[PDB]
Amino acid sequence: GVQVETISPGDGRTFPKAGQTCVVHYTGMLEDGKKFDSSRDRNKPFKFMLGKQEVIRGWEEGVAQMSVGQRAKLTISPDYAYGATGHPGIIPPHATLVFDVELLKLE
Amino acid sequence: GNEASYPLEMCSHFDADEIKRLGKRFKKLDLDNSGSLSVEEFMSLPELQQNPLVQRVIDIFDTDGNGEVDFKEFIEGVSQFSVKGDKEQKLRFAFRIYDMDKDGYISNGELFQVLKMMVGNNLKDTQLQQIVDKTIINADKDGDGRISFEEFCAVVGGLDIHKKMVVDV
Amino acid sequence: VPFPPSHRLTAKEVFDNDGKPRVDILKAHLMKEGRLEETVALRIITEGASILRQEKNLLDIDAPVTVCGDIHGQFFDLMKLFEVGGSPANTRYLFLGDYVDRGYFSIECVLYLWALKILYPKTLFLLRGNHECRHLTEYFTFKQECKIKYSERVYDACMDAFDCLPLAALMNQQFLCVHGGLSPEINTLDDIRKLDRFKEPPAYGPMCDILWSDPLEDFGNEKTQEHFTHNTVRGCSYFYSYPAVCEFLQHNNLLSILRAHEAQDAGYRMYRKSQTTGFPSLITIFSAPNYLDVYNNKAAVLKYENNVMNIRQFNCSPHPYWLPNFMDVFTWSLPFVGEKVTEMLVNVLNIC
Ligand SMILES: C=CC[C@@H]1/C=C(\C)C[C@H](C)C[C@H](OC)[C@H]2O[C@@](O)(C(=O)C(=O)N3CCCC[C@H]3C(=O)O[C@H](/C(C)=C/[C@@H]3CC[C@@H](O)[C@H](OC)C3)[C@H](C)[C@@H](O)CC1=O)[C@H](C)C[C@@H]2OC
Ligand SMILES: *C(=O)CCCCCCCCCCCCC
Ligand SMILES: [Ca+2]
Ligand SMILES: [Ca+2]
Ligand SMILES: [Ca+2]
Ligand SMILES: [Ca+2]
Ligand SMILES: [Fe+3]
Ligand SMILES: [Zn+2]
């Protein structure tokens, strides 16, 4: 699964809808918390848009559960992420990834 | 196309029925019924919109270089992805995704253009340019400042990406 | 966008006739993402290592001194640090460790700092940090970095050099300067002196603690007054208390414990002060601004002179982009290229 634990509030009413472009800043980490990437590294907010299968499952199911301005910890499981194949160069096989995601804007 | 004309000769992994099946696909796809197939017609259906590689695939398939994918090219093309397809023809296909002008070498500019195509605005151009420069500085083993198939495969060859470039026909 | 210079600096370019490195030539080259000849790089590392090897576990440093915290491979912020703290040419420096990992410019940091140590062996001091070891560098991106930019030969050289790094510093007969902090098995300065420094830090013990300790998350308003407790954060070493620090201080007649090891949003942290002296019992100095490019923190350097501890703050500086783990654009883009290319065909075939 993708377990969401809030870090910062946001308006508890404006959640993202399918087709809507979610503008976010994230910092991905391995289960031990060791960071592996972040949009802050590029000072570029990662923009993807719900529904259209543009991110791993954990993100679709997780970022949907977030309100604008909310900063939360999505704890995604391999099957909802990169599974046993992992991802060449960054993600080791059978890995649980914790994402600190901050829903910035919607467009 | 639907009807007659003289013989199409091709080379592939496909058996008599797989070609028939693919033949029917190419049929629906034909839209204007010209026998060939163009980007406008490929762009025709639902999930060929935000697939940044669609015009790339068309150009690799377009072996005779005339803008359209004819049946022979359609078969030859999809055959690279057939199961029974060898890992090498798949990595060669991959090389062709970056090697825009088909001259056998991935140049700095091509690598930047192909990547920008998929990344869009998720990376600043200076960032993308910086990492393109550093990848070529390191993989360029032979010296000419442009990546050949030999060098591509030296960096990529051990990745299992090709094990997924497989479609059912 | 600028391109990294292909010309690798040679011995005669980096070292002058007196065998003195030309840190100015080095700085300029490194900043453009320039590389040295593996042999030159190795000479810098190895010659600095020889100097460090001769120094004592606990250095004896006189004020004036600019004390600096974690650097973490943020080479371009290391350049700003020197602007704020003063030229090494006329300013005494003391670094508290953690020169590598996190930042993708760790080798340029060791090379510039080692050359600077060769150049100012008696005014620029480097202390050991928990990251200057094998287990952490293999875990994080330093080993991978040495392999991408140079080779494992350079890496091994750094490892053996790191084993030569002093463990602590007694600054102005007043402060105990270390990277992590106190240890249950270190109750006096002699306890540090009697340690064997030349090795990979043990899984536990005095040397481990010095490099790994942290004050309790509640270094003042505690209810217990337990001196040392296991550090659940670090998965090793301890957490030390205000009474613990006040006990070490009184016992060894020290003013305060200056250290780093912990990110600070203001680049520093003054802890609960001594009821006798109106001075903080502990000080954390952190010299890596915008840590991990994530934390939006300021960095800082302690400047101690004429009985005045002045803290200078500084902000982040621009730096080139490296994909996560030095991964190349091909390895980076391929899985996506495969996915989409296959998806186009799946979609194309599914029209029947
Ligand atoms: C041409 C360049 C490639 C192209 C790159 C970009 C647009 C730049 C963009 C900021 C990505 C980062 O680049 C710095 C980097 O982000 C990670 O670090 C990361 O934080 C992560 O997990 N993210 C990113 C944010 C959305 C969630 C998730 C994801 O869903 O990512 C997607 C992903 C990797 C899905 C895989 C694809 C293969 C399938 O087989 C697998 O199915 C199991 C799932 C991303 C968005 C792909 O659509 C696009 C790309 O890959 C990955 C660890 C690796 C990835 O680099 C590759
Ligand atoms: C239009 O221009 C022709 C497109 C139709 C092609 C289908 C041909 C069927 C091929 C099946 C024979 C198997 C060959 C070994
Ligand atoms: Ca047509
Ligand atoms: Ca054609
Ligand atoms: Ca080319
Ligand atoms: Ca070449
Ligand atoms: Fe640190
Ligand atoms: Zn540390």
* Main-chain dihedrals φ then ψ at residue C246, nearest 5 degrees: -65, -25
Helix and strand counts by DSSP (H, E) for chain C: 12, 14
Closest Cα in chain C to B166: C342
What is the C-alpha separation between C67 and C95, in angstroms, rounded?
A: 6
Distance, in angstroms, between C332 CA and closest chain B CA?
A: 10
What is the C-alpha separation between B114 and A66, in angstroms, rounded?
A: 33
Query: Is B21–C352 a contact, with Cβ atoms under 8 angstroms apart?
Result: yes
Q: Are B110 and B101 in contact (CB under 8 A)?
A: yes
Query: Is A42–B50 a contact, with Cβ atoms under 8 angstroms apart?
Result: no
Structure-determination approach: X-ray
Each residue of A15-40: b (16+ CB within 10 Å) or e?
A: bbeeeeebbbbbbbbeeeeebbbbbb
Q: Which residues pair with A5 in a beta bridge?
A: A73
Q: Are B150 and B92 in contact (CB under 8 A)?
A: no
SS3 of A104, please? strand
SS3 of B121, please? coil
Tokens of C127: 């202390």
Q: For the CA atoms of B67, B73, B76, B81, what is the dihedral angle to 10 degrees?
A: 50
* Main-chain dihedrals φ then ψ at residue C300, nearest 5 degrees: -160, 165
Tokens of A63: 């970022």
CB-based contacts of C205, cutoff 8 Å, min separation 6:
C183, C185
What is the C-alpha separation between B30 and B35, in angstroms, rounded?
A: 6
Q: Does C139 touch chain A (CB under 8 A)?
A: yes
Closest by alpha carbon to B113, among B45, B52, B38? B52
In chain C, % helix, strand, coil (3-state, to 5) comes to 35, 20, 45
Closest by alpha carbon to A91, among A2, A29, A41? A29
Q: Are C166 and C57 in contact (CB under 8 A)?
A: yes
Q: Are C294 and C262 in contact (CB under 8 A)?
A: no
Q: Are B42 and B48 in contact (CB under 8 A)?
A: yes
CATH number of A1-107: 3.10.50.40
Tokens of C325: 């783990």
Resolution (A): 2.5
What is the C-alpha separation between B27 and B35, in angstroms, rounded?
A: 8
Query: Can you tell me which residue has the tokens 């790191």?
Result: C162
What is the C-alpha separation between C57 and C195, in angstroms, rounded?
A: 8
Query: Could you tell me the distance, in angstroms and rounded to a whole number, from the CA of residue B138 to the centre of ligand 6?
Result: 10
What is the C-alpha separation between B142 and B150, in angstroms, rounded?
A: 9
Give the nearest partner residue to B97 out of C33, C337, C352, using CB atoms: C337
Query: Can you tell me which residue has the tokens 């009184």?
Result: C250
Each residue of A41-72: b (16+ CB within 10 Å) or e?
A: bbeebbbbbbeeeebbebbbebbbebbbebbb
What is the C-alpha separation between C95 and A85, in angstroms, rounded?
A: 42
Q: Mutate which of A21, A23, A25, A44 to disrupt the B interface (most B C-beta within 10 Å)?
A: A44
Q: Are C70 and C287 in contact (CB under 8 A)?
A: yes
* Main-chain dihedrals φ then ψ at residue C137, nearest 5 degrees: -75, -25
Query: Is B124–A52 a contact, with Cβ atoms under 8 angstroms apart?
Result: no
Query: Can you tell me which residue has the tokens 């592996």?
Result: A36
> How many CB atoms are closer than 10 A to CB C103?
27
Q: Indicate the residue type of C42.
A: L
Q: Are A19 and A49 in contact (CB under 8 A)?
A: yes
C-alpha B38 chain-centroid distance: 15
Tokens of B160: 């299992």
Q: What angle do CA C188, C191, C194 make, to 5 degrees?
A: 150
Name the residue ranges covered by the structural domains of chain C: 1-352
What is the C-alpha separation between C329 and B113, in angstroms, rounded?
A: 12
Would strands A21-30 and A35-38 be described as parallel, antiparallel, or unpaired?
A: antiparallel
* Main-chain dihedrals φ then ψ at residue B167, nearest 5 degrees: -115, 150
| A41 in catalytic set | no
Closest Cα in chain C to B152: C330
Closest Cα in chain B to A48: B122
* Beta carbon of C340 within 6 Å of any ligand 1 atom: no
C84-89 CB contacts, 8 Å cutoff, 24+ apart: C84/C301, C84/C312, C84/C314, C85/C301, C85/C303, C85/C312, C88/C23, C88/C116, C88/C119, C88/C120, C88/C123, C88/C124, C89/C120
* Beta carbon of A23 within 6 Å of any ligand 1 atom: no
What is the C-alpha separation between C115 and C340, in angstroms, rounded?
A: 49
What is the C-alpha separation between C106 and A24, in angstroms, rounded?
A: 29
Q: Are C176 and C248 in contact (CB under 8 A)?
A: yes
CATH number of C1-352: 3.60.21.10
Closest by alpha carbon to B161, among C334, C349, C127? C334
Is C296 annotated to bind ligand?
A: no
Tokens of B46: 């639902």
Between positions 47 and 66 of B, the ones with CB within 8 A of C are 47-48, 51-54, 56-57
SS3 of A73, please? strand
Q: Are B69 and B36 in contact (CB under 8 A)?
A: yes
Closest by alpha carbon to B98, among B157, B161, B152? B152
Tell me, which fold does domain B1-169 have in CATH?
Recoverin; domain 1 (1.10.238)
Q: Are B80 and B91 in contact (CB under 8 A)?
A: no
Is B82 annotated to bind ligand?
A: no
